[PDB]
Amino acid sequence: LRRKTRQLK
Amino acid sequence: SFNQFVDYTLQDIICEDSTLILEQLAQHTTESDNISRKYEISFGKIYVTKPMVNESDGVTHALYPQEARLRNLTYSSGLFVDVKKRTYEAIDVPGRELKYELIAEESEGKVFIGRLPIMLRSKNCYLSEATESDLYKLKECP
Amino acid sequence: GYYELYRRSTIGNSLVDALDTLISDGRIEASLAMRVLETFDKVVAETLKDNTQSKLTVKGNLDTYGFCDDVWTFIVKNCQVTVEQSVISVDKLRIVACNSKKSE
Amino acid sequence: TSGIVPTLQNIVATVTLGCRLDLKTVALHARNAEYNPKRFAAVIMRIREPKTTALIFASGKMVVTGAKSEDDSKLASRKYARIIQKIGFAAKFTDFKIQNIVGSCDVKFPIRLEGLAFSHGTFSSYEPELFPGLIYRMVKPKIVLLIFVSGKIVLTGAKQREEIYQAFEAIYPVLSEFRKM
Amino acid sequence: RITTLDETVGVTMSHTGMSMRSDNSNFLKVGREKAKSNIKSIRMPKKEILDYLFKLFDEYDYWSLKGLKERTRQPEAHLKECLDKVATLVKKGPYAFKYTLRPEYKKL
Amino acid sequence: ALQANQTDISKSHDSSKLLWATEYIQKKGKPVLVNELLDYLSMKKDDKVIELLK
Amino acid sequence: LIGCRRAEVARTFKEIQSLIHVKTKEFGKTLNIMKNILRGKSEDGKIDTDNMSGAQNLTYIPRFCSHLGLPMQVTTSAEYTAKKCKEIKEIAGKSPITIAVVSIYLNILLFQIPITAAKVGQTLQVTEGTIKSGYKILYEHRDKLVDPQLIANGVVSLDNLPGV
Amino acid sequence: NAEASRVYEIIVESVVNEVREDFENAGIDEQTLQDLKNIWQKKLTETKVTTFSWDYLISPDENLMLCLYDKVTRTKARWKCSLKDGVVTINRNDYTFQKAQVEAEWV
Amino acid sequence: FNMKLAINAKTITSGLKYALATGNWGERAGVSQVLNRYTYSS
């Protein structure tokens, strides 16, 4: 499972 | 130098990282929860008020340089920026690129972001538009 | 699933008599009759939701109320019923109601 | 001293039966019952002659409320047990104890709530932005009194007639000292 | 150039800090979105749910706790007693933290 | 109501049937013959559960 | 909330609730409990004064007026009217916010500032009907709710206040 | 009531039209549909309900209403019920309503 | 989500005030000095 909270530039 | 910074630099600085996007991935746990949400905060134009001071009781009034010196206050003005808030969501079909779509949630509004000290006799200062007689009235030395 | 309360109404009671009378004659299967009742609720429910617009109100004094299995049951005595115009006097009125939100 | 006897408005009493009851059976066999296990784990029952409400639990515990008198509450509780007995379940009257009595009265003059909250800062608790009535927590007897600007006093917490009367007598002198204007 | 607000400073600052005005925005109201859904359920007696579980196990041989509460829609307290009495949970295996029917009844 | 509350042993699966038998067995101080079981579950002929019990 | 009260810069329950997401019921019960604990240690181990009184509506007026941008002259009149507003029994039992808000509204029309009631109640989050409703009761005692010096000087006249 | 008769005609029409598929599954003859339609209609007109085109315990002639309730509340002596999409029979007269309001006082 | 709390205005205000009240330009030394007022030429 992913981090369920990702920031994209 | 200060006039240039207040007039142009402040807008430029905000326009560098004005956009923040938070990605909420699909988090595949069940077929009933397969929507991916995207929340974005965008900073618009910045606004600067005249010098002012906030007191303990919560009353805010214009502050003049003479009053600031006596009360050990700070001669500063407020900074406000228009913030545009949007959110996009899409159906996360497995093994395919997503197409984020506006979900009819777009709100707009000024948000305080701190106080900028104002140099005396600047474009934003109260004494720039004051004549010789006006300066005498405000107890300031020409 | 749809509630079976409608079978107690005049239309429902008439259907039961019609189907049961044919059952005694042996021209209709008992299981087949049940299928008709299941479809009776669907058609009755469908038309009621879309093909009615009248409104009536009743005012009176409650004599007995009850609730169980998401089915309310009130009994209003000496009440006046008005439709859309003309009031109707009822000595004893029994109320049977089911949950508006269908239980799937 | 006061010259006006407070009028009881609500009596909360707890009774036990000592036997297990089937709420659904009572609900289906009782004229006025409301059993909704989804929301609450008891069947609500009411009767007309005493104008009282009863909460019947599956453990044989009963909570009678709305009775305006102790003798009336006893009659209502007996009737509530009789109704259960008439259904078929084994229900017998047992210890009947009252856990709270509510009374009301009026002094017929305004009160300066600010003064009361200042002088008697310990007993009083004035929060006008939440409730427009001051809260008084009497220490002896231990009874809570609600005092309003309009001169209406609500007494709650007393378990007997003597206690409620004593509280009202003990609060009148202090109450009169803070009359507005 | 940056615009200068000519309105009274007191008015411009009325939307900052501890203000009587309440936010009407629906942005990032995650708690509101999901907290709105909440409902209780009564325990379906063992007389009835005992058959439900075995039919449930016959469908699939590795059944999780979260799905079990959702499918049964019963409190986990009593729901635990039936599950432990009939099934067992393997924690150290590859299918960790998943209840499976005991071999006594599965091997039938 | 109690008479209607009783549930027949026509359960969904044979495994569920064995549970009621075993639950009935453990609540007995001494071993119970088949006849005692037949009074419990509404089935008399030889059942696969009985064979599985052994 | 307690800290603000002790400093004579008190805030209202709604104002604090704007920043901290706490429902009124939990907030109210906690405040009472904490006050008792402070009271308990105050005796065994001052803490409360006249400011400790919940109402203290005089302190709210200056902040509320600032949000509307009224001149300092108007605020001073409101303080006097609010101070004398407690003499009326039919409104003394109302919440302090409404008493101050209604008092502020009376002075706004007294000086004829072009601000409609729809905005006064919007800024202070008070129902417009409540502001209008409170004005009606106050209209019956306008003589006792206006500073004698202001009327004596002639800055404001009682004929500028409409009557329902 | 004209509206009540119109709804009744729709209900009977829907049942016969919809039940045809099930009847063919059971292999029953076509004529049975006419018999079912005929017998049912005579029952409705026989009841003479409306004009047609053709203590403490719990123990036609009785007026009864079967419907659904949206929300019911009470205030200490009064009951308010919001009903919708129901049929009511009073004094041998039948009526239908999209919505209804009940205002009764519990003595 | 509360915008009033998401954006903390004290970060900008304190940061600018601290850098100007004291010489330190972080969060170079002696950048800010108290203006001399002994005489007009000074």
Side-chain angles (χ1 to χ4, degrees), chain A, chain B, chain C, chain D, chain E, chain F residues 1 4 7-54, chain G, chain H, chain I:
Chain A
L1 72 167
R2 303 315 311 151
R3 313 300 315 161
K4 76 165 77 169
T5 47
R6 185 175 179 178
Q7 189 174 356
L8 295 174
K9 293 179 179 178
Chain B
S1 64
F2 189 75
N3 289 346
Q4 174 69 358
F5 156 76
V6 165
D7 281 9
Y8 298 93
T9 299
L10 275 169
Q11 179 58 21
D12 288 346
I13 289 165
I14 290 164
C15 287
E16 294 291 354
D17 308 328
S18 53
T19 303
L20 298 172
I21 50 184
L22 188 149
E23 185 186 3
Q24 186 173 355
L25 269 179
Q27 189 65 40
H28 281 295
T29 181
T30 184
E31 285 296 324
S32 70
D33 169 52
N34 57 310
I35 62 178
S36 68
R37 297 183 179 277
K38 198 164 83 167
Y39 296 102
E40 178 175 359
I41 297 172
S42 180
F43 284 121
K45 290 174 67 174
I46 181 168
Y47 308 74
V48 64
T49 59
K50 285 297 211 300
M52 77 203 160
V53 62
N54 58 346
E55 277 147 33
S56 65
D57 59 351
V59 71
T60 302
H61 61 117
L63 179 66
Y64 280 86
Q66 191 266 338
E67 174 165 10
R69 274 179 201 121
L70 287 174
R71 294 179 65 185
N72 295 4
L73 299 168
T74 300
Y75 198 66
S76 74
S77 297
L79 294 158
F80 293 80
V81 295
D82 282 344
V83 179
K84 293 175 67 172
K85 294 186 290 186
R86 298 177 186 173
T87 179
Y88 300 88
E89 71 181 5
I91 311 305
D92 179 273
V93 70
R96 192 189 297 281
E97 183 174 10
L98 289 80
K99 189 256 284 178
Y100 287 116
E101 185 177 2
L102 186 151
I103 195 54
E105 290 176 349
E106 174 175 298
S107 308
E108 298 179 350
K110 293 177 180 177
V111 176
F112 183 57
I113 59 169
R115 292 207 173 72
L116 181 84
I118 297 299
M119 213 165 49
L120 280 73
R121 310 289 272 274
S122 295
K123 182 172 180 176
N124 196 3
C125 176
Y126 275 122
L127 309 183
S128 164
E129 192 173 2
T131 71
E132 183 177 0
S133 295
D134 298 308
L135 270 161
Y136 274 111
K137 298 289 180 64
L138 290 178
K139 295 178 179 179
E140 279 276 312
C141 183
Chain C
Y2 293 163
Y3 307 102
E4 300 85 354
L5 80 167
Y6 294 110
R7 297 183 188 174
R8 293 178 59 196
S9 44
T10 51
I11 46 158
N13 183 58
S14 310
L15 188 150
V16 170
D17 304 310
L19 274 181
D20 288 345
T21 291
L22 266 289
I23 287 278
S24 295
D25 199 11
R27 315 203 317 115
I28 309 186
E29 184 178 2
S31 295
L32 174 57
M34 294 298 293
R35 291 305 314 286
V36 181
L37 269 295
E38 304 322 298
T39 45
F40 182 72
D41 292 330
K42 172 60 175 293
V43 298
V44 167
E46 207 67 15
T47 181
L48 279 179
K49 296 286 180 64
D50 195 6
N51 206 334
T52 184
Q53 73 96 24
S54 290
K55 308 168 53 52
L56 58 92
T57 68
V58 58
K59 293 179 179 179
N61 291 351
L62 268 167
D63 189 74
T64 288
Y65 66 90
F67 173 83
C68 181
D69 290 345
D70 279 28
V71 170
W72 275 98
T73 301
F74 318 93
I75 294 171
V76 187
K77 281 183 169 176
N78 293 319
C79 63
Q80 302 291 323
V81 177
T82 184
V83 177
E84 297 199 68
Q85 281 282 29
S86 165
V87 303
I88 298 96
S89 160
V90 184
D91 57 65
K92 167 155 176 307
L93 193 67
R94 177 160 159 194
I95 294 165
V96 167
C98 291
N99 191 290
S100 66
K101 165 59 74 155
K102 60 188 182 293
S103 180
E104 294 177 350
Chain D
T1 74
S2 63
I4 185 167
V5 67
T7 58
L8 311 181
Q9 302 302 136
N10 185 9
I11 305 179
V12 187
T14 297
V15 181
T16 193
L17 296 173
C19 296
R20 293 182 183 174
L21 308 172
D22 206 20
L23 308 188
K24 192 168 85 172
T25 309
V26 173
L28 296 172
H29 303 342
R31 186 179 295 278
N32 292 339
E34 173 172 1
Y35 176 55
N36 190 355
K38 273 195 218 195
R39 284 188 308 149
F40 191 43
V43 62
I44 296 164
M45 185 167 284
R46 308 198 171 105
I47 50 177
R48 295 177 182 279
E49 188 274 330
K51 191 176 165 53
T52 52
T53 298
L55 301 173
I56 305 291
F57 287 78
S59 60
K61 297 291 181 65
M62 180 176 69
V63 187
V64 185
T65 188
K68 294 181 181 297
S69 168
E70 284 67 1
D71 60 84
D72 279 13
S73 181
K74 285 219 88 167
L75 266 70
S77 48
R78 290 162 193 277
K79 278 171 257 198
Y80 290 129
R82 209 172 301 128
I83 291 160
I84 301 285
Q85 186 174 355
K86 198 179 282 183
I87 291 164
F89 295 99
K92 63 179 182 178
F93 195 65
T94 309
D95 289 345
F96 163 88
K97 195 184 156 189
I98 292 165
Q99 299 300 131
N100 189 1
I101 293 167
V102 181
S104 195
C105 56
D106 49 356
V107 288
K108 296 179 179 179
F109 52 71
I111 300 163
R112 269 204 316 103
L113 274 62
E114 295 274 308
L116 186 55
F118 171 45
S119 299
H120 310 77
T122 71
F123 305 148
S124 299
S125 187
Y126 190 28
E127 53 193 343
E129 288 180 350
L130 294 171
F131 187 69
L134 190 139
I135 309 298
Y136 184 80
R137 310 203 90 71
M138 186 179 265
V139 303
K140 181 65 173 67
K142 184 177 184 293
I143 282 161
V144 182
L145 288 92
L146 323 177
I147 294 167
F148 294 86
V149 175
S150 58
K152 315 298 186 69
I153 300 92
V154 178
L155 291 87
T156 307
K159 291 180 170 57
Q160 291 180 335
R161 279 75 177 272
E162 294 177 350
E163 286 184 350
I164 181 159
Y165 305 149
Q166 186 173 355
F168 186 46
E169 292 175 350
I171 201 77
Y172 175 46
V174 293
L175 192 149
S176 185
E177 184 177 2
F178 283 84
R179 69 173 66 198
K180 185 169 72 175
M181 184 174 70
Chain E
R1 292 181 178 82
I2 185 166
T3 73
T4 299
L5 303 171
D6 60 355
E7 193 173 5
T8 315
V9 299
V11 177
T12 304
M13 289 289 297
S14 64
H15 315 265
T16 301
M18 282 192 181
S19 67
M20 291 280 282
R21 215 175 306 228
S22 43
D23 62 327
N24 268 359
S25 178
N26 56 18
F27 183 72
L28 268 287
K29 299 279 182 207
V30 175
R32 180 177 65 82
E33 288 283 329
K34 67 178 184 181
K36 186 187 183 69
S37 55
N38 199 333
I39 185 58
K40 293 180 178 181
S41 45
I42 192 63
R43 287 177 293 100
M44 192 165 178
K46 180 187 183 68
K47 296 286 178 63
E48 282 82 0
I49 199 78
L50 191 141
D51 303 330
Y52 212 80
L53 270 298
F54 273 109
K55 247 189 173 189
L56 186 145
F57 289 104
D58 192 6
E59 291 178 353
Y60 197 67
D61 59 308
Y62 285 123
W63 189 244
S64 300
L65 175 52
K66 287 182 177 179
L68 197 157
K69 191 170 68 177
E70 180 46 79
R71 198 66 53 85
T72 57
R73 259 184 72 180
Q74 306 183 191
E76 72 288 340
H78 191 178
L79 184 67
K80 212 171 182 298
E81 298 176 356
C82 296
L83 187 57
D84 288 345
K85 199 145 71 167
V86 306
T88 185
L89 72 166
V90 179
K91 297 181 183 181
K92 324 309 179 81
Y95 302 157
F97 319 123
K98 287 180 175 296
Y99 289 79
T100 197
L101 193 68
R102 279 188 194 197
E104 271 173 46
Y105 300 98
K106 180 172 66 170
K107 191 186 170 180
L108 300 175
Chain F
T7 309
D8 295 346
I9 203 79
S10 63
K11 319 312 301 301
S12 306
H13 288 89
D14 59 354
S15 293
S16 76
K17 293 174 66 174
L18 198 150
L19 263 72
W20 272 102
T22 48
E23 188 57 275
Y24 182 63
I25 286 165
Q26 186 61 60
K27 59 174 275 288
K28 288 287 185 185
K30 66 183 79 173
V32 286
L33 291 161
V34 175
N35 191 31
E36 294 300 320
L37 297 184
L38 308 197
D39 191 4
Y40 204 70
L41 77 165
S42 66
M43 285 181 75
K44 293 182 166 181
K45 288 177 180 174
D46 284 348
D47 193 8
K48 285 182 181 177
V49 159
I50 286 166
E51 193 64 51
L52 293 173
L53 200 61
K54 298 164 90 154
Chain G
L1 188 149
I2 293 166
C4 296
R5 285 184 179 175
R6 306 297 182 106
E8 295 177 350
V9 305
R11 310 279 167 157
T12 71
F13 285 60
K14 191 160 277 187
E15 286 173 347
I16 299 177
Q17 285 180 22
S18 178
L19 287 178
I20 297 167
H21 188 292
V22 65
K23 289 153 67 176
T24 308
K25 188 173 178 183
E26 289 271 3
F27 189 86
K29 301 298 291 188
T30 298
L31 182 70
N32 191 31
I33 297 161
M34 278 215 292
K35 273 170 76 70
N36 276 358
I37 291 167
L38 295 170
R39 187 66 46 68
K41 266 161 190 82
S42 169
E43 184 178 2
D44 296 305
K46 60 182 183 292
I47 50 166
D48 59 69
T49 50
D50 293 310
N51 192 35
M52 179 54 69
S53 56
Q56 65 178 346
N57 61 58
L58 282 73
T59 61
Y60 299 162
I61 297 160
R63 181 190 331 133
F64 289 3
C65 290
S66 174
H67 294 314
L68 301 166
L70 315 181
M72 205 83 206
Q73 286 185 333
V74 167
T75 304
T76 300
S77 179
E79 293 175 350
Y80 185 93
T81 298
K83 186 257 184 182
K84 284 284 180 198
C85 189
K86 64 198 278 200
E87 184 177 1
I88 308 302
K89 61 178 76 175
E90 293 84 356
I91 188 166
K94 290 209 171 198
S95 159
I97 296 165
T98 58
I99 294 168
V101 169
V102 172
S103 289
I104 289 161
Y105 186 67
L106 186 66
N107 306 267
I108 285 156
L109 295 175
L110 193 65
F111 279 55
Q112 294 180 151
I113 300 105
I115 297 291
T116 307
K119 211 204 172 202
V120 178
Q122 186 173 355
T123 296
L124 301 181
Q125 281 301 291
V126 178
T127 302
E128 193 269 339
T130 299
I131 301 181
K132 303 286 294 312
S133 177
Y135 180 33
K136 187 170 74 65
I137 297 89
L138 271 70
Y139 191 65
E140 191 172 1
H141 306 274
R142 76 190 102 181
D143 58 352
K144 302 142 74 187
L145 296 181
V146 176
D147 190 273
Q149 298 177 336
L150 270 66
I151 184 174
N153 281 9
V155 176
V156 286
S157 176
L158 271 54
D159 199 6
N160 290 306
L161 293 173
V164 176
Chain H
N1 179 21
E3 178 176 359
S5 309
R6 174 172 57 79
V7 174
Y8 277 26
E9 300 279 319
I10 291 150
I11 291 171
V12 60
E13 279 297 316
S14 310
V15 171
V16 299
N17 294 127
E18 204 278 345
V19 70
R20 180 176 292 102
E21 285 76 71
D22 201 287
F23 280 165
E24 300 310 320
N25 191 302
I28 192 64
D29 56 274
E30 169 50 60
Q31 175 69 344
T32 47
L33 283 167
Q34 295 301 318
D35 306 296
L36 186 140
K37 179 80 153 173
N38 193 34
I39 187 167
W40 195 9
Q41 293 168 310
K42 298 302 297 188
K43 296 258 182 202
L44 274 296
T45 197
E46 177 51 43
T47 60
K48 291 173 66 174
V49 298
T50 310
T51 63
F52 291 110
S53 295
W54 53 68
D55 203 358
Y56 294 120
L57 278 62
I58 284 285
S59 57
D61 194 294
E62 184 172 309
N63 311 312
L64 181 59
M65 180 177 73
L66 317 178
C67 73
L68 290 72
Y69 80 89
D70 183 28
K71 59 187 307 193
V72 55
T73 59
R74 61 185 181 276
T75 301
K76 291 167 66 179
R78 291 191 266 90
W79 284 72
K80 280 181 193 298
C81 303
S82 295
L83 314 166
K84 63 199 290 188
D85 311 276
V87 62
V88 55
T89 81
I90 296 166
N91 304 121
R92 311 273 157 72
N93 287 329
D94 293 346
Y95 304 85
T96 181
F97 59 96
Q98 178 63 47
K99 292 179 180 179
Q101 186 69 35
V102 183
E103 187 159 300
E105 193 277 331
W106 191 85
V107 176
Chain I
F1 190 84
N2 204 3
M3 271 296 263
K4 292 180 177 72
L5 188 152
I7 294 156
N8 197 4
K10 188 63 71 75
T11 288
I12 303 302
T13 302
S14 291
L16 298 171
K17 249 174 72 184
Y18 176 77
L20 282 161
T22 67
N24 286 283
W25 213 238
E27 69 181 73
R28 294 181 277 174
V31 182
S32 289
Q33 314 185 12
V34 177
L35 184 61
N36 291 113
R37 289 280 196 190
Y38 202 97
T39 188
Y40 192 81
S41 54
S42 170

